[PDB]
RNA sequence: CGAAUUGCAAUGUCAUUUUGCGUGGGGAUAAAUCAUUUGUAUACGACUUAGA
RNA sequence: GCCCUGAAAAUGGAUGGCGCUCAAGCGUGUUACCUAUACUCUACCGUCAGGGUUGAUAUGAUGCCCUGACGAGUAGGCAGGCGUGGAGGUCAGUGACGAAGCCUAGACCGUAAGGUCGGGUCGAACGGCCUCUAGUGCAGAUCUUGGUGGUAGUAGCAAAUA
RNA sequence: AGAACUGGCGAUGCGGGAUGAACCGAACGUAGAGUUAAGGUGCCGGAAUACACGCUCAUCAGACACCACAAAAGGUGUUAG
RNA sequence: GGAAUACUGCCAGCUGGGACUGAGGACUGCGACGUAAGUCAAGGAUGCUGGCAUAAUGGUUAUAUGCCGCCCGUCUUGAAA
RNA sequence: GAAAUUGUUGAAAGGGAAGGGCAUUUGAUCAGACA
């Protein structure tokens, strides 16, 4: 009834980084239910969206989506790296992104 | 996974909570911590007392209203530990520490809402049996808290008002189990039992 | 990085064209370049490398 | 005009390369000057500081001097200057000079519309 | 004379491509994409719908028809990545589909280049529907419905819509 | 009973605060500041008082 | 071996901080994981070297093309270049239908020095190219001259009886 | 303060040692993907609140060499010998 | 007495997913498959489909955010001093 | 009729400095038609 989602809610945690310096070209995503790189490998290649509400109504609507994809795995606990057409704005470290299942292997 | 989380802090260790809280709240989860006077901490009382009396010692000499504000309440000791773990000097630490709401005892809103427990900080699991541990209410009171004898007068009313609820619910569900156990001998359940329900 | 034996980006200390601007020497250079490229002889090469020379290294005979 | 012969223009460091401490002092313009100092932090190339010019930033030889349309610019002043680009049209584009009279803008443009030449500043002194 | 010409004005008549060596071959699908197996769409208008796979067309796609009677889709084509292939199958040997190909579905809309200025319903072949598709969609599902009505709770399963719940971990569960 | 032709994917629109506009059904009809003044007060501001 | 006594200094304070106690400590061992301008592969720039080409194409070979390696840098050296005032040639160069100059979080090119364009302002001379020539390029010198600010409506305009 | 051989700083940025002219790693054209160094993976902080055998509980514990200190002598506190 | 398995190594053994790159621009070469013609994944990407013709997308500029960033010139072994 | 410096208007931001570099969101502006 209520449920209509075909996606998997995750969090934008941070950017790729060392200590004291960062790479905003790459972001780190925490998927809910994923706990290891094995059992994250299912999600490589999948699409990611960050929705946000804007003010102007452009090509129809008020909301706007930044699209990207998952690339690989980060270290030992279910974190993945993601790459976007246009890197994320860093006001979102704590933001719910949505991973689709669109390019599937099933 | 839930939008807001309510952490009972009894039998917990402080710095092993706060490293979970300070990350779960930096990643976007709202947390409240409740019954903080029942927290626990490693080490003997005199020792963890001196580790506070060597904090009260540290105040800005030329004007002590500028200096380290030594808070005496458990809700604020925990917040100190978390503020240290968070880059509170930016708009990310700031934004995180407004996702947090810490209390002593359990007020009404979080009274009728479920509570949870962080197992990787429970003194029970973590500490050796035989070690000495110190309780934050006794500590806060010894360093200048005031409202210990109030929380005990309120949380007890909470408890006796809750125990009756639990008994009500139990003496309701003991018959739900009977009327759904009286209905589990049909094909609808013999077929589900093969699916695993 | 690379541990170097040799000075990097070192020009060969020879000259491969005349410092002059005598166009009627540019032409003989054009000619002997051709006859040194499209020939198996060293006389041409010697003459080529001699046309480039300065007035003290190209003395009167 | 159509110009379909050039490959994926790319520009390393499309910023402007401002001088150091042009943002602070007004005498110090933004035209680039190299810091020859000794206790500096730009000649020494620290982190967080600005980037000095190099030849590594040099643009590709196939995409140098090309406007984003793909044509490269030729500054003109009369019709005699256009009539050289009668044949070199899909590669070159005309920029009318800043000292030209409006009486002579229109004749130039009238000749360019005929020869198929593409002008970069036809709305100059339209009057 | 506001600028000097280059020395000889090199001319740049366009030349040709090199003889490429990249060719096309037939696509290789997964193991699961057996005709008759149920799929679960993942995008488009009919996302969430469970359907049935029939024919691998030659535009590198997958033909389906959720029975229109059931779930509200016609015959259509899908990209094979934007689906999931469940582990439930049907006998599809009763139907015939070779009439269907990459031009059965092809539209010939004359509004091919002017979507940018003509925007207020210009009425150029953009509404109608004909009896030539309904007959195929009827003959095909009248045969397929039968194998659905062999099994229980399949007319009801295709009628439903897929949706992820809260405790659903797609990297663990078996479609 | 209808649900195709978003033509092989392009959030595909619902969340919740704050503000206004008017429509119509009600409901209630004031204090502070300046100026004047007192000196339990005061560098000025401030504070304290009085005034139909 | 660990711990403890031995072990006492002056603004409040430092395993970096929080905090940690079958450690988030110590000793040792095993795998995984994070990441530098380093290493490997690819693209691009430039330099150096080695090659091919006067078949003859725009007679150019100054160029064009193929291959490989390389790139830190003060003092300092050399090379190729941008720019300014004036000179000789040239575009039968621009221009009162608006030259030069000036303003322009407006545009293009160039790694860059810098060049070009549009708009506004303004009102009489000015440029590109091959060359010549210098009183030729400023953030600085308790620099020179001129001008203008913050402090500042501030200190303060209070001896001489009114 | 003064000599020997070498390596460096000077003239040199970069990742690490919180910070540091010299230490460890490693030397720089502009960029992209991958892999590592030295150092590290509770949180700040990217990365295992990993696995394993043990020692220690300190009323001034102890915790990244250079390095930012600590002894003689003692203790039935405990462990092993 | 007869086997297996582990561990280490080898395969010019098969197979699945994912990420970045598409440089070059007639032919010439090495090879493979084929009776031949010819075809090929073999001296650097082609095909099919859809969307857009302007907030598509891109540049500049302002602000917000994460990380970093001490004031230049100078003498100096050494200057933010 | 430049600049420092200053007034008015407009936009924007602003917890014990400001300014800068990389990356992007949002806003402003420009782009190009590929008719």
From Swiss-Prot, chain A:
Residues that bear N-acetylalanine: 1
PROSITE patterns linked to this entry: RIBOSOMAL_L35AE
Predominant place of localization: cytoplasm
S-adenosyl-L-methionine in keyword set: no
PTM comment text: N-terminally acetylated by acetyltransferase NatA.
Gene Ontology cellular-component annotations: cytosol; cytosolic large ribosomal subunit
GO molecular-function term, one example from the UniProt record: structural constituent of ribosome
Entry-linked Pfam families: Ribosomal_L35Ae
Cross-link (Glycyl lysine isopeptide (Lys-Gly) (interchain with G-Cter in ubiquitin)): 46
BP GO annotations: cytoplasmic translation; ribosomal large subunit assembly; ribosomal large subunit biogenesis; rRNA processing
Keywords for the protein's UniProt record, in alphabetical order: Acetylation, Cytoplasm, Isopeptide bond, Ribonucleoprotein, Ribosomal protein, Ubl conjugation
Cell compartments where the protein resides: Cytoplasm
InterPro entries from the UniProt entry: Ribosomal_eL33 (IPR001780), Ribosomal_eL33_CS (IPR018266), Ribosomal_eL33_sf (IPR038661), Transl_B-barrel_sf (IPR009000)
Matching PANTHER family: 60S RIBOSOMAL PROTEIN L35A
Family (UniProt): Belongs to the eukaryotic ribosomal protein eL33 family.
Additional record remark: There are 2 genes for eL33 in yeast.
Assembly with partners or alone: Component of the large ribosomal subunit (LSU). Mature yeast ribosomes consist of a small (40S) and a large (60S) subunit. The 40S small subunit contains 1 molecule of ribosomal RNA (18S rRNA) and 33 different proteins (encoded by 57 genes). The large 60S subunit contains 3 rRNA molecules (25S, 5.8S and 5S rRNA) and 46 different proteins (encoded by 81 genes).
Protein's name in the database: Large ribosomal subunit protein eL33A
Provenance organism: Saccharomyces cerevisiae (strain ATCC 204508 / S288c) (Baker's yeast)
Name of encoding gene: RPL33A
Swiss-Prot record, chain C:
Location of N6,N6,N6-trimethyllysine modifications: 49
Signal peptide stretch: none
Localization: Cytoplasm
Miscellaneous information on this protein: There are 2 genes for eL18 in yeast.
Subunit structure: Component of the large ribosomal subunit (LSU). Mature yeast ribosomes consist of a small (40S) and a large (60S) subunit. The 40S small subunit contains 1 molecule of ribosomal RNA (18S rRNA) and 33 different proteins (encoded by 57 genes). The large 60S subunit contains 3 rRNA molecules (25S, 5.8S and 5S rRNA) and 46 different proteins (encoded by 81 genes). eL18 interacts with NAP1.
Record-stated family: Belongs to the eukaryotic ribosomal protein eL18 family.
Chain's role: Component of the ribosome, a large ribonucleoprotein complex responsible for the synthesis of proteins in the cell. The small ribosomal subunit (SSU) binds messenger RNAs (mRNAs) and translates the encoded message by selecting cognate aminoacyl-transfer RNA (tRNA) molecules. The large subunit (LSU) contains the ribosomal catalytic site termed the peptidyl transferase center (PTC), which catalyzes the formation of peptide bonds, thereby polymerizing the amino acids delivered by tRNAs into a polypeptide chain.
Protein name: Large ribosomal subunit protein eL18A
Organism: Saccharomyces cerevisiae (strain ATCC 204508 / S288c)
Whole-protein coverage range: 2 to 62 of 186
UniProtKB/Swiss-Prot annotation, chain D:
Subcellular location(s) of the protein: Cytoplasm
Family matches, as InterPro entries: Ribosomal_eL32 (IPR001515), Ribosomal_eL32_CS (IPR018263), Ribosomal_eL32_sf (IPR036351)
Biological process per Gene Ontology, one example term: cytoplasmic translation
Assigned GO CC terms: cytoplasm; cytosol; cytosolic large ribosomal subunit
Cleavable signal peptide: none
Primary role: Component of the ribosome, a large ribonucleoprotein complex responsible for the synthesis of proteins in the cell. The small ribosomal subunit (SSU) binds messenger RNAs (mRNAs) and translates the encoded message by selecting cognate aminoacyl-transfer RNA (tRNA) molecules. The large subunit (LSU) contains the ribosomal catalytic site termed the peptidyl transferase center (PTC), which catalyzes the formation of peptide bonds, thereby polymerizing the amino acids delivered by tRNAs into a polypeptide chain.
Protein name: Large ribosomal subunit protein eL32
Source species: Saccharomyces cerevisiae (strain ATCC 204508 / S288c)
From Swiss-Prot, chain E:
Keyword annotations from UniProtKB, A to Z: Acetylation, Cytoplasm, Isopeptide bond, Phosphoprotein, Ribonucleoprotein, Ribosomal protein, Ubl conjugation
Keyword match Iron: no
Residue list for modification Phosphoserine: 11
Main location: cytoplasm
Superkingdom: Eukaryota
Modified residues (N-acetylserine): 1
CDD domains referenced in this protein's UniProt entry, alphabetically: KOW_RPL6
Chain residue numbers at which the record places covalent cross-link Glycyl lysine isopeptide (Lys-Gly) (interchain with G-Cter in ubiquitin): 127
Localization terms from the record: Cytoplasm
Processing and modification events after translation: N-terminally acetylated by acetyltransferase NatA.
Miscellaneous comment text of the record: Present with 37100 molecules/cell in log phase SD medium.
Family: Belongs to the eukaryotic ribosomal protein eL6 family.
Name the UniProt record assigns to this protein: Large ribosomal subunit protein eL6A
Lineage: Eukaryota, Fungi, Dikarya, Ascomycota, Saccharomycotina
């Amino acid at each position: 009834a209520e449920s209509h989602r075909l996606y998997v809610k995750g969090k934008h945690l941070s950017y790729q980084r060392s200590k004291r310096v960062n790479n905003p070209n790459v972001s780190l995503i925490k998927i809910e239910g994923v706990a290891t790189p094995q059992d994250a490998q299912f999600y490589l290649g999948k699409r990611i969206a960050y929705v946000y509400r804007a003010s102007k109504e452009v090509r129809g609507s008020k909301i706007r989506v930044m699209w990207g994809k998952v690339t690989r795995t980060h270290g030992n606990s279910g974190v993945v790296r993601a790459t976007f057409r246009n890197n994320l704005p860093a006001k979102t470290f704590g933001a719910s992104v949505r991973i689709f299942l669109y390019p599937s292997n099933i | 996974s839930q939008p807001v989380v309510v952490i009972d802090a009894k039998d917990h260790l402080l710095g092993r909570l706060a490293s979970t809280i300070a990350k779960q709240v930096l990643n976007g989860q709202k947390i409240v911590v409740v019954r903080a006077e029942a927290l626990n901490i490693s080490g003997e009382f005199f020792r963890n007392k001196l580790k506070y009396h060597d904090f009260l010692r540290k105040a800005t000499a030329f004007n002590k209203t500028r200096g380290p504000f030594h808070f005496r309440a458990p809700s604020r000791i925990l917040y100190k530990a978390i503020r240290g773990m968070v880059s509170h000097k930016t708009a990310r630490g700031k934004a995180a520490l407004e996702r947090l709401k810490i209390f002593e005892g359990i007020p009404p809103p979080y009274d009728k809402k479920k509570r949870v427990v962080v197992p990787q900080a429970l003194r029970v699991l973590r500490l050796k049996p035989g070690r000495k541990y110190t309780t934050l209410g006794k500590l806060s009171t010894s360093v200048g808290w005031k409202y210990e004898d109030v929380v005990a007068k309120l949380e007890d009313k909470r408890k006796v008002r809750s125990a009756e609820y639990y008994a009500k619910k139990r003496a309701f569900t003991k018959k739900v189990s009977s009327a759904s156990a009286a209905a589990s001998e049909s094909d609808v359940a013999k077929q589900l039992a093969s699916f695993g329900y | 990085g690379i541990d170097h034996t040799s000075k990097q980006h070192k020009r060969s200390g020879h000259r491969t064209a005349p410092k002059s601007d005598n166009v009627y020497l540019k032409l003989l250079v054009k000619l002997y370049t051709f006859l040194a490229r499209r020939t198996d002889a060293p006389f041409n090469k010697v003459v080529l490398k001699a046309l480039f020379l300065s007035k003290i290294n190209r003395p009167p005979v | 005009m159509a110009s379909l012969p050039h490959p994926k223009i790319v520009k390393k460091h499309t910023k402007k390369f401002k001088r150091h401490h042009s943002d602070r002092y007004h005498r110090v313009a933004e035209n680039w000057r190299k810091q020859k100092g000794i206790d500096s932090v730009v000649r020494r190339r620290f982190r967080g500081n600005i980037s000095q010019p190099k030849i590594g930033y040099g643009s590709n030889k196939k995409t140098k001097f090309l406007s984003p349309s793909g044509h490269k610019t030729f500054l003109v002043a009369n019709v005699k200057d256009l009539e050289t680009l009668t044949m070199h049209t899909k590669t070159y584009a005309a920029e009318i000079a800043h000292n030209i009279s409006a009486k002579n803008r229109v004749v130039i443009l009238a000749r360019a519309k005929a020869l198929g030449i593409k002008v970069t500043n036809p709305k100059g002194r339209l009057a | 004379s506001a600028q000097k010409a280059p020395k000889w004005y090199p001319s740049e008549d366009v030349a040709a491509l090199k003889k490429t060596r990249k060719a096309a071959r037939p696509q290789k699908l997964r193991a699961s994409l057996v005709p008759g197996t149920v799929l679960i769409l993942l995008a488009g208008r009919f996302r969430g719908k469970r359907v049935v796979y029939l024919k691998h067309l030659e535009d590198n796609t997958l033909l389906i028809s959720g029975p229109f009677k059931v779930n509200g889709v016609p015959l259509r084509r899908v990209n094979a990545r934007y689906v999931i292939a469940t582990s439930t199958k049907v006998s599809v040997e009763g139907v015939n589909v070779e009439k269907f190909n990459v031009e059965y579905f092809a539209k010939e809309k004359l509004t091919k280049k002017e979507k940018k200025e003509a925007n207020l319903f210009p009425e150029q072949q953009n509404k109608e529907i004909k009896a030539e598709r309904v007959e195929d969609q009827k003959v095909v599902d009248k045969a397929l419905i039968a194998e659905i009505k062999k099994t229980p709770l399949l007319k009801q399963y295709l009628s439903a819509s897929f949706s992820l719940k809260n405790g659903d971990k797609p990297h663990m569960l078996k479609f």
